[PDB]
Design a protein around this nucleic acid. Structure first.
Ligand SMILES: O=C(O)c1ccc(P(c2ccccc2)c2ccccc2)cc1
Ligand SMILES: [Au+]
Ligand SMILES: [Mg+2]
Lengths: 14, 98, 107, 87, 95, 95, 107, 82, 98
DNA sequence: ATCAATATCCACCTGCAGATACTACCAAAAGTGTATTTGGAAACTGCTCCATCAAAAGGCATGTTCAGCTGATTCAGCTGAACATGCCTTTTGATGGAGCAGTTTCCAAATACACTTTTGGTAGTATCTGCAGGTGGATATTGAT
DNA sequence: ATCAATATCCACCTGCAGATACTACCAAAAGTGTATTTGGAAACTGCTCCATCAAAAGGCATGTTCAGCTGAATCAGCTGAACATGCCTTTTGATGGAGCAGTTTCCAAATACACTTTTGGTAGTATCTGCAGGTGGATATTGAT
């Protein structure tokens, strides 16, 4: 729910 | 019957078009092309007539500039005939592409 | 005894207007008394330079009225105006007559 | 109402002769037959880029009409600054 | 009929100073207008940046002057600086 | 001995979210600083122009969003616009 | 009692600093509440994108510390980042391995 | 054994720059032509930098002076501030 | 007695220098050239260490870019040897003069 | 083919330069509470943009014909790549002081306000006039012979 | 270097389109001339970091030998220019219809502003370690034969 990149990875969770 | 040799009328045309400032693309075709491309981005668009003339003045000045650079690219290769590879090299060096 | 800041400074170009445009354009918090006067003077200088040369191009082409072609000839034939305006298009300007030498005929 | 007539294939209104004329102003003496299609492609790309920016200004303004100023601002952004149409 | 303003009046004065028998088309005037707005923005912009670069909140003739040295080429800068240094020095000692 | 601000602390956090085991050199951090400041100026810059063009005194989310559409290529614009709308959403929904 | 505008917006990038840099920058007289949230999110996104791809490039060279070379490889190997940064020099970045095909030896 | 500072930009160094640029073969005229281009580049950037210095009433050209100069000459540099 | 054929070391240097990022001009000659050019604009000038490095970084990146464009102009003309006319044409189309 | 010279590649090692981690101090972000400014919502213009159509120059499409340009081939000569050395220039590492930048102080200069005055825009009107577009007729250029 | 086909030049001669130049005219903006605020040049001084200068170290100047690239000469195939012929579509100049820009007036949100409370982010510092060298030995590459 943080930052979503183009590669399809996120930034963890909370 | 008496024919000009290849290149004589081409040089006549260069002298004539380099002397004048009139837009060289027909007005209505160019307006249709603007409306088509704009419509593909957003439906229900209208244009100030001066918007379309501004686009046409900007497009012609761009293509004229590009043909000068393209001609330098043909002449650098020891030709006098511009080819796609001359436009491509012009655009690559202008950093209009990778 | 109302004097315009133009007349104080000896300029045709409007110092008032230029002070305002520096105000509404959010260039800085505050604008000095000098700034508008200096700017209005530079703008006036440059327009005088262009109109001198375009005037000459009009007269060369046996004409009394400066048109965009005369401004294009003026700008493009002057090394320094050409550099100042190197990324500008003058609507209805055309180009300079110029044929690459190799393209000309015969031996 | 009337709905607009469908617009397709208008790039072909940039005719071979119109491209020859532009090449002449640019000092070109001889032209490969492949140049015409290559010029249409380069022109479409150039118009799409300037119109996309003009229409973006139109939409930001909440207008339905593309103004000369929208085009002039798009050309300036693109580093193709145009004199003669305001700004 | 909303008052839309331009530099026409002043361009035409300067035309008459340099070429007293010469006219200008509205198109040509349109270009001269574009030219003034353009050089205005370029100089105001350089000045804006110049002030920020030096943690100043004021654009003075000194910021305009440097902006002119950065924006104009050699000779146009020389002459432009003269007319602006003059116009100021006069505007000051005309009070 | 005065405060020299940077985005280093934030670049370092986002690095840890993205590559938890991965470090960053001093020179690399200088480039990332340059990066943020550059995109900052480009976006603020377009926003400022947009507002001025529309005779507005105010830069809102809407000027930032249009600025992003004008300045970022294709997918970068799409994703950037969505991260931006999402952050404004989350923030408006915060008592 | 105090919660950072960042922590509310769900961001690592400083919403407060961005708000101030917009004020001290002479972009506009006034600044909507959202504008610095959006801007800070956009800058965080683009930072994540670049640190993602630079991380990958670091890992690929059997490395755990990002250097400028890793930033240059990430950027120039991505069509979109390469366009965004087309007129930018990454100090100590070098270039991509690229030998024009016609320069390769015959056998 | 004294020579110009420009010739301090030596054949082997120019040959290395070309090589990073992917050049296989180099005409001997390139070395003087390259020195010409290099001079103009540094002239144009150092002029604008020094104009920044003078404006700040300083006697030392900063990295920022250079970075600000590179930016407006359309050669934006990252890693030295700004 | 073993000797590498023309172009084989050239390719090896290309692979080597495209792999690395070290500045390829010696620092002191460059510093001297900076200070010379600068003297003509203001005398008794000092330079931060980082200011000179900024200049060398920018100037080497510029020349490397220019050799790439130059190489394309040579390859354009059906050659593999860069010449003055190749640098000149690259500069012209980039709009650095003429 | 073979054979060797040299370049390149991967595993392991290890000292310290250049990271990450930690702390107290304060500039600058957030909190609260009035103080101003704005940017839709509604409600009307006239402007100007869409459309449609009729008549006629004016330019476009196409097919034919061959001049001469491109690009493939061959080849000679010159011009750059390679290379083996030592010396000369740069790089490295260790001190004096120029000058950047920290900072506080007070006034010359810029803002804020609200007057009065004048400029510059426009609408309307007329009033003039430069020049585009046309037409001959004298003159230059090109290409056959 | 003679000649004829055809483009080009230039000087006349119109009829407006577009320029100039009145108005009168007014509305917004520029100017005036105190009341209030403050930003920046001034002066002082401290403590970085820049210039200089003398041992440590490899990079470059050099001249020679020839591989193979560039460019010159030649030639044939065929692409692209010129131009004639047929006619479609653009240009031009109306008319009517309305969509929508552009204005101008209430404001209830929205953001600025002035002041206080709080803490995140910076700069010393204080540790921790990623990796640029270096070595050893296997294998790959290149070019001779
Ligand atoms: O945009 C580029 O980066 C670019 C690079 C090279 C070329 P030239 C080219 C010619 C020979 C070898 C290599 C390149 C080209 C392009 C199309 C057909 C034939 C030749 C054109 C563009
Ligand atoms: Au090519
Ligand atoms: Mg469509």
């Amino acid at each position: 729910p943080g930052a979503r990149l183009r590669s399809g990875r996120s930034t963890g969770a909370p | 019957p008496h024919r000009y040799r290849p290149g004589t009328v081409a040089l006549r045309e260069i002298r004539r078009y380099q002397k004048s400032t009139e837009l060289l693309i027909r007005k209505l075709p160019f307006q249709r092309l603007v409306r088509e491309i704009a419509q593909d981005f957003k439906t229900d668009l209208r244009f100030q007539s001066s918007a379309v003339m501004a686009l046409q003045e900007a497009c012609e000045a761009y293509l004229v500039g590009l043909f000068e650079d393209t001609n330098l690219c043909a002449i650098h290769a020891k030709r006098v005939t511009i080819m796609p590879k001359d436009i491509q090299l012009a655009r690559r060096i202008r950093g209009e592409r990778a | 005894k109302a004097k315009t800041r133009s007349s104080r400074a000896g300029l045709q170009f409007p110092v008032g207007r230029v002070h305002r445009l520096l105000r509404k354009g959010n260039y800085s918090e505050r604008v000095g008394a000098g700034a508008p006067v200096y700017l209005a003077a530079v703008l006036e200088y440059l327009t005088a330079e262009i109109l001198e040369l375009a005037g000459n191009a009009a007269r060369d082409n046996k004409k009394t009225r400066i048109i965009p072609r005369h401004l294009q000839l003026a700008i493009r034939n002057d090394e320094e105006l050409n550099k100042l305006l190197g990324r500008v298009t003058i609507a209805q300007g055309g180009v300079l007559p110029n044929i690459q030498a190799v393209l000309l005929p015969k031996k | 109402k009337r709905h607009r007539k469908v617009l397709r294939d208008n790039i072909q209104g940039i005719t071979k002769p119109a491209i020859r004329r532009l090449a002449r102003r640019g000092g070109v003496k001889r032209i490969s037959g492949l140049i015409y299609e290559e010029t249409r492609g380069v022109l479409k790309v150039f118009l799409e880029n300037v119109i996309r920016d003009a229409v973006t200004y139109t939409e930001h303004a909440k207008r339905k009409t593309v103004t000369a100023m929208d085009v002039v601002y798009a050309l300036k952004r693109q580093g193709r600054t145009l004199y003669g149409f305001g700004g | 009929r909303s008052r839309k303003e331009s530099y026409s009046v002043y361009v035409y004065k300067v035309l008459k100073q340099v070429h007293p028998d010469t006219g200008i088309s509205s198109k040509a005037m349109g270009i001269m207008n574009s030219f003034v707005n353009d050089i205005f923005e370029r100089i105001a912009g350089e000045a804006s940046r110049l002030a920020h670069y030096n943690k100043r909140s004021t654009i003075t003739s000194r910021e305009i002057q440097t902006a002119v040295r950065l924006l104009l080429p050699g000779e146009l800068a020389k002459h432009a600086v003269s007319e602006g240094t003059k116009a100021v020095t006069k505007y000051t000692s005309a009070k």
